[PDB]
Amino acid sequence: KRHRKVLRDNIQGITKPAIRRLARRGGVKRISGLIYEETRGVLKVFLENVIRDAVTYTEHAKRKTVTAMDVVYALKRQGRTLYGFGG
């Protein structure tokens, strides 16, 4: 089949070589086989907390689109400010 098993693992689209890339940026040598789903839990909690803020921003401003500067404001909410987009 095109998709293995029952699929529906959009978060499992961030595959184990990709998490291996993110880990090898982070200066780790060996990775245990029980890192990936917990890293995915970090993905869930971080993206929920940012996307909730950004959708609150764009829902107050009567707009159906999410602007990158609203994402920068939502990351300025949590001390998580990035650069390169304006501010």
Partner: protein, 97 residues
């Protein structure tokens, strides 16, 4: 007949990825995942490309800080690999929960 000892190419992967600076996640899985998550709040929520790209950038920066933290935690723990105990330790001492 050229099977390497495990770790030398790991050092080479460390050097190539720390020397490199581009995005590390394929953009379409992250796009579909963000499209999945954001529909749970409201419907018909499109994004700019800079929005999604920014989200991938912030997520990757948060993850690389987290994994540097857990690797320092693991090496305080006299081990040379990471375990989810190190993950929840770094999520405790930095104060997220």
């Amino acid at each position: 007949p050229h099977r390497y000892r495990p770790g030398t190419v790991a050092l080479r992967e460390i050097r190539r990825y720390q020397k490199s600076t581009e995005l590390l996640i394929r953009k379409l899985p992250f796009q579909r995942l963000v499209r999945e998550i954001a529909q749970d709040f409201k419907t018909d929520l499109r994004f700019q490309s800079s929005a999604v790209m920014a989200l991938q950038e912030a997520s990757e920066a948060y993850l690389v800080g987290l994994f540097e933290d857990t690797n320092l935690a693991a090496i305080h723990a006299k081990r040379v690999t990471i375990m989810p105990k190190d993950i929840q330790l770094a999520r405790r001492i930095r104060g997220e929960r």
